[PDB]
Ligand binder design. Structure first.
Ligand SMILES: [Zn+2]
Length: 78
């Protein structure tokens, strides 16, 4: 289903900057791929864009909170 998709998302983090305080795996699992700019990531499903990640930030929570209508985030959490 989203099998290869999550794996593709993971691959986009090859250039992710070193000091970002959230794991790339968690980002990719939350539906986000890396835009190649700063620490800005984008949902493959709804296009929600997020950057300036802080220690302890939950990509899934931010995702659910900001753009609940995303089918991916709805199905991930259900
Ligand atoms: Zn989304």
């Amino acid at each position: 289903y989203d099998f290869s998709c999550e794996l593709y998302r993971m691959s986009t983090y090859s250039t992710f900057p070193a000091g970002v305080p959230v794991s790339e795996r968690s980002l990719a699992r939350a539906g986000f791929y890396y835009t190649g700019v700063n620490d800005k990531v984008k949902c493959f499903c709804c296009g929600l864009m997020l950057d300036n990640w802080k220690l302890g930030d939950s990509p899934i929570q931010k995702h659910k909170q900001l753009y609940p209508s995303c089918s991916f985030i709805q199905n991930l959490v259900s």
